[PDB]
Design a protein around this ligand. Structure first.
Ligand code: NCA
Lengths: 72, 225
């Protein structure tokens, strides 16, 4: 499925993910597409910062959800 | 309740504490799939706070939408000035219980742009007390509203200054009796045409709604479109 990551530079990143993917996995995918090191990524969804090791499903992140990237 | 009575109730609310405006891209979808099941899981609907003298924009990207004017008495799940994101009701939870409990108590991304305070990310905005928000230095402008009567207070500074605000966002569960009018963009033939289709569909079910033009903190009855 695809989710969208909005940055504060006005970019929207499209990612192909399964709901069993980890936040770690999602941050790796953002490394692959934008060269951002995972340790510098905060991922925000619906008013909370997402924890590495938990899955998209665990946070209820559905198809076409919008996350917000903030650099640490 | 008849057409003139709905209009009168609408304009009274508009000129007091305000009410709701819900534009829709697909009015046949809204009629058949949102409105009709309420007569015989789209429990929460997005809408925008409108009020006389509040220069509030509506969500209408290409300026060609119709929609519903909805009573200030609809059940309120939460209100967020800058539309802090919410999650969809997950499987296994009751939709009617989901808000205000899971409604963000402040706009995380909004408060962070405003203050650059990285402590903000240490909390869950849905599970935070007023005291915690004070400790984080979360400005009042980014705190959500849960009592409808207090939305005009949240919107008072732009209203007093006469400034334009982007579309605000309430989560409401509206009942058929809450539907007071049909929104019409006077400069859009497509909006007017959709509005007529919607008026006919609603009238056939016993809900004869006025046509309402809203713009820039003013609202007027349109005799026909
Ligand atoms: N459909 C709407 O009126 C609306 C209002 C606020 C946010 N999104 C949609």
């Amino acid at each position: 499925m695809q989710i969208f990551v909005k940055t504060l530079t006005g970019k929207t990143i499209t990612l192909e993910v399964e709901s069993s993917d980890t936040i770690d996995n999602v941050k790796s995918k953002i490394q692959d597409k934008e060269g951002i090191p995972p340790d510098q990524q905060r991922l925000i969804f619906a008013g909370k910062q997402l924890e590495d090791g938990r899955t998209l499903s665990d946070y209820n992140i559905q198809k076409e959800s919008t996350l917000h990237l903030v650099l640490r | 309740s008849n057409r003139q009575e709905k209009l009168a109730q609408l304009m009274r609310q508009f000129e007091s504490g305000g009410l709701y405006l819900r534009t829709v891209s697909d009015h046949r979808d809204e009629f058949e799939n949102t409105f009709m099941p309420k007569l015989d899981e789209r429990y929460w609907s997005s809408a925008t706070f409108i009020q006389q003298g509040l220069n509030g924009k509506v969500h209408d990207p290409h300026a060609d939408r119709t929609g519903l004017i909805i009573s200030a008495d609809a059940r309120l799940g939460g209100f967020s000035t800058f539309d802090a994101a919410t999650a969809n009701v997950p499987s296994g939870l009751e939709p009617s219980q989901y808000f205000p409990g899971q409604f963000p108590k402040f706009d995380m991304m909004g408060a962070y742009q405003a203050t650059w305070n990285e402590d903000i990310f240490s909390v869950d905005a849905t599970a935070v007390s007023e005291q915690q928000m004070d400790e984080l230095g979360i400005p009042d402008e980014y705190r959500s509203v849960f009592d409808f009567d207090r939305i005009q207070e949240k919107m008072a500074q732009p209203r007093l200054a006469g400034r334009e605000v982007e579309p605000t966002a309430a989560k409401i569960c509206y009942q058929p009796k809450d539907v007071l009018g049909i929104y019409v963009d006077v400069d859009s033939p497509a909006s007017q045409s959709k509005a007529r289709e919607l008026q006919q569909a609603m009238r056939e079910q016993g809900f004869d709604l006025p046509f309402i033009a809203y713009r820039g903190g003013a609202a007027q009855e349109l005799a026909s479109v």
